[PDB]
Design a protein around this ligand. Structure first.
Ligand SMILES: CC(C)NC(=O)c1ccc2ccccc2n1
Ligand SMILES: [Cl-]
Ligand SMILES: [Cl-]
Length: 182
């Protein structure tokens, strides 16, 4: 009902349509990307500095670190939204790596529609310190996007890209795309 064809538009990038959204995967350093929103996969304290979270907090800078710990003490949050700091984005959405990945991605998509944003870049959420299995993480990310499209919710969001630290995890995402393709 939804899936287009898998192709490679640029070296190391793989893409397919999911309804009106372009879904892409690539390996690399997510802190070098430009998008309306970049997603961080962190702890329930929003102060982890290991793996992807280390790179994101160090690049973003100390004002973003302090925004995080200020919101964490105010209430119990499933995720938090901060400024971009010195990353090339309008906002960072910090999700909890150990939480249900489909739920986390659904929340990111909803928040981006609320701001009329068009582009999102995320890591392989949960595959770092949280040690969720890559096969289950890929299935959950793509399922969230399918559900969002099926419900008629995609209006401003046009591009969702997963930038993945390890090439071996990229292989798992590409196999999942080929399983789904029209
Ligand atoms: C070798 C291993 C311990 N490093 C990591 O897990 C890791 C993850 C994401 C990164 C993003 C930018 C830069 C370095 C990064 N390193
Ligand atoms: Cl994680
Ligand atoms: Cl990753």
């Amino acid at each position: 009902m939804f899936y287009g064809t898998v192709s490679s538009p640029d070296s190391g990038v793989y893409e397919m349509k999911i309804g009106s959204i372009i879904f892409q995967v690539a390996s690399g350093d997510i802190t070098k990307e430009e998008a309306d929103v970049i997603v961080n996969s962190t702890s329930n304290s929003f102060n982890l500095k290991a793996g992807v979270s280390k790179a994101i907090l160090e690049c973003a800078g100390q004002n973003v670190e302090r925004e995080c710990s200020q919101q964490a003490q105010q209430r119990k949050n499933d995720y938090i939204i901060t400024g971009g700091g010195f990353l090339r984005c309008k906002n960072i959405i910090h999700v909890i790596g150990g939480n249900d990945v489909k739920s986390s991605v659904s929340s990111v998509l909803q928040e981006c529609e609320k701001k009329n944003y068009s582009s999102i870049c995320l890591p392989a959420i949960g595959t770092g310190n949280a040690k969720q299995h890559p096969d289950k993480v890929a299935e959950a990310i793509i399922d969230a996007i399918e559900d969002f499209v099926q419900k008629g919710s995609a209006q401003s969001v046009k591009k969702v890209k997963v930038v993945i630290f390890l090439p071996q995890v990229l292989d798992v995402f590409y196999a999942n795309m080929k399983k789904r393709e029209g």
